[PDB]
């Protein structure tokens, strides 16, 4: 029987398994290679994964996500207090342990964070078991580098609840580094920086590796970046265009903005793989067609401050590590936003042309390394 690697993500999870000399990332029964870390409670049932995320807007008080933010934390944690203001679900105090409170089958129920995460882990276990065709009972689970003993232990408890034997809790950037084989270089100290940007979260980690042994040298989280701010720049740019060509302002038109916005989100995505993108919205405002385009270079320019700001945590992490940028040996990119060419450019131009580890899907590189490490721990 094979061991599995699980990235228990704050928003999405991912499971892999090492088989026949390679890591296989396993698709769930809907065909998706990541599964939302969502757990929904309803009048009749419990839904986990895609089913849970699919009905969030119709059942927002009873659809739990972000349990990773609560796990291993005290209720009076300033982070817990801060975060509560952003969730549409209730979090209660029970002995100074946070619990998410919910309507489930016509009853009021509270759950520990590790109980919500265990249900996500049961899901990843079932995904792995359906693919392999046998019971899976051994897992490496990953956590962020900044996790404390309690956060680490609470995650292991979630594993144990899911029925897993947690072989090891490993750091996410460690996992990403193992994915790229950076632990194989033998004796001698190597500085690796993992740049993890995607899903509105940003973590820079510097690790030192020596004889396959990892040490966390620095972590730096600029916490919120990669979303609606880029969308707004594009929206404002095009609102201006329309104002210029047709001499009319669309700013104070609620539906038209959401429409032009949808167009800009699409266009943005296209520009990660193309140097230009067309926008074409039928009768956008007062019966007037808005067919235009934007170049990649123009998009980057509109958002140049928003892009440059990604190097702040890099420069911070370097300081805490007490390292010059010239002392970093290897770069690893994780998280969806690292697909953005400008992100890759900025990083490379900052690090003087140094090559980037980026060939593994940046959403999958952590589950990948965890799956590698799970097979090592069984061999």
């Amino acid at each position: 029987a094979a061991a599995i690697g699980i990235d228990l993500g704050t928003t999405y999870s991912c499971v892999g398994v090492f088989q026949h000399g390679k890591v296989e990332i396993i698709a769930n029964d809907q065909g998706n290679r990541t599964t939302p870390s969502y757990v929904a409670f309803t009048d009749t049932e419990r839904l986990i994964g895609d089913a849970a995320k699919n009905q969030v807007a119709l059942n927002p008080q009873n659809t739990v996500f972000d349990a990773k933010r609560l796990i291993g934390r005290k209720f009076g944690d300033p982070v817990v207090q801060s975060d509560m203001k952003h969730w549409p679900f209730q979090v209660i105090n029970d002995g100074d342990k946070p619990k998410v409170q919910v309507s489930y089958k016509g009853e009021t129920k509270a759950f520990y964070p590790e109980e919500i995460s265990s249900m996500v882990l049961t899901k990843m276990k079932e995904i792995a078991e359906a693919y392999l065709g046998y019971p899976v009972t051994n897992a490496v689970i990953t956590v962020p580098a900044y996790f404390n003993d309690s956060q680490r232990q609470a995650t292991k408890d979630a594993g144990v609840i899911a029925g897993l034997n947690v072989l090891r809790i490993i750091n996410e950037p460690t996992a990403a580094a193992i994915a790229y084989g950076l632990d194989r270089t033998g004796k001698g100290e190597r500085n690796v920086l993992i740049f993890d940007l995607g899903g509105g979260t940003f973590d820079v980690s510097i690790l030192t590796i020596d004889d396959g042994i990892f040490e966390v040298k620095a972590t730096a989280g600029d916490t919120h970046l990669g979303g609606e701010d880029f969308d707004n720049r594009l929206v404002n740019h095009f609102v201006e265009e329309f104002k210029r060509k047709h001499k009319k302002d669309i700013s104070q038109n609620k539906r038209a903005v959401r429409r032009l916005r949808t167009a800009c989100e699409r266009a943005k995505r296209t520009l990660s793989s193309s140097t230009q993108a067309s926008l074409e919205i039928d009768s956008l405002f007062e019966g007037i067609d808005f067919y235009t385009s934007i170049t990649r270079a123009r998009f980057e320019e509109l958002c140049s401050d928003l892009f440059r700001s990604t190097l702040e945590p890099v420069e911070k992490a370097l300081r805490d590590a007490k390292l010059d940028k010239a002392q970093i040996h290897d770069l690893v990119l994780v998280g969806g936003s690292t697909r953005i060419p400008k992100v890759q450019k900025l990083l490379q131009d900052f690090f003087n042309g140094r090559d980037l580890n980026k060939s593994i899907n940046p959403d999958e590189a952590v589950a990948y390394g965890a799956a590698v490490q799970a097979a090592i721990l069984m061999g």
Partner: protein
Amino acid sequence: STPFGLDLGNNNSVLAVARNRGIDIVVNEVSNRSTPSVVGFGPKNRYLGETGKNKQTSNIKNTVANLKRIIGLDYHHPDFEQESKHFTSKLVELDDKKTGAEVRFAGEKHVFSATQLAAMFIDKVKDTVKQDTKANITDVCIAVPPWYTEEQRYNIADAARIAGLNPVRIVNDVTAAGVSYGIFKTDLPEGEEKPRIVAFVDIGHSSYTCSIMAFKKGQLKVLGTACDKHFGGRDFDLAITEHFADEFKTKYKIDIRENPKAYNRILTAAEKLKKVLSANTNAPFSVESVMNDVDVSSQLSREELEELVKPLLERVTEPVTKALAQAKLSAEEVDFVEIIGGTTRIPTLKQSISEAFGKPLSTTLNQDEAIAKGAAFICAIHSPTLRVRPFKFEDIHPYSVSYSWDKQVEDEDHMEVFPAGSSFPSTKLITLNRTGDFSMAASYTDITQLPPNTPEQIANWEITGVQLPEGQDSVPVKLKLRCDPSGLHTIEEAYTIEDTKTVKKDDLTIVAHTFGLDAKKLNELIEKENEMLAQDKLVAETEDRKNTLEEYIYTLRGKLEEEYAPFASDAEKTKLQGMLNKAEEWLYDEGFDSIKAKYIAKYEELASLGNIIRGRYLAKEEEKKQAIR
């Protein structure tokens, strides 16, 4: 050269390659593990794959999807309409009575055959692979549906040739999935042991295939195969769209059937709703501005969806029952049922397949990758530089095939050569007494066993160079009749014998007339493809040189203001800002749509001065590092 397998799907295509000690999935320019099977056309260039898809909703009239489905399609085929209803572009009859797409492209009206169109896509997808692999790719194995006709297999093989590839084998797709099953499972029965019986069910965008196979270590045989070519995800999307078409007439007083663009918006949204319904039991349906100013907001339950496709689901067990009857077995004799294809994620289908086999479903293959991986393994089997672990497989030959010959001195003028329900590939050796040059042909022994309107004749041959010996009566000609690994009916050798001893005398020349194209026609089509490729490439490179210019303007402007500031005189800075400003304004005027050379020229004026400042900046950087070390 690296073996390349192609799962050419109606909706998406999967790319796999055989390298290192294994087989890898090739990822596209957008990093996707499949590429949309779309050929679109614009005023300047073609939109192929991902870009085709990106442009699709804005140019539906000039975007062809359903590429697979129009290969070898008679324009007046009794079931043309089941094909054409899924097209958004203009279809037209070709000179051979087949169907092409008419399209506005580069400012003119263009007609392309299904072969040409499929070649364009194969060529794009070939480029993805050699940009990923850095390698030379010359050979493909293409996976097709088992219902593909002999003609259709020749057609798609010619499509590969127009894309500059050698179609090393055209493989049945779930045979390719079964091969990838076989090469990856490590516990297969080994000797006198009963083989493992595994049924494979593939339901995709357009087709539903059941194929039942016997496995031992290093081998498979296909026992039974049945298809419904009119059962797929696209039929669910369409039933959902038609349901909402009716609903919106009463609810919103709008008629989306009279508005192709509106209709297409609903169709697109209907697939997303269908997928939600594989996970959830109810789903809202919300589409903003389906027309001018009109937002629709409705819903659908899984049970309502299941009712919508009731007429389709009446046929849900047929490919299973048909594949078992062919295999000459009962459902209980199947050990495992493996499920692949996107449409098998639908709960009603899963229950129906499970119930028809009396077994739980297995999912130990990646459903999306299995066919492409098997196709890449099969492509490797064909490389002269052999380094694959061998795997033997035989596929089913559903129809009886006879060969005929100029009678002459033979008592018979035909015989059954390849029986109904035998295997391919297969070679049959015959010797015939001959009075001179002669014709031959291959045909279906019983045409009633074939699809409606199937011509009986498969191929014919003109065999010449026959010379009679001294006793000028007859002479024995030895023939090699081959159903090749693609299941194609060939003659691959003919020679005169009888030069106390038997001996070859004269090697006879064979002229073949098949569904394959002439070398003259092949080269003409290869030419057209090369021209379109050059045009696409010119446009892609000029768009790149211009985005590179615009980026450098912004980048060098910011650097002059920051880290380059100490490294430029006032005269150097203001000169360069002036030309930066002027280059930016040019990109809105004459440079809005200029030529490659001018984007390069403009960049070189700027960079030639910018590099001088950079080279001062870099010098003091290195200097500070000597003050370090």
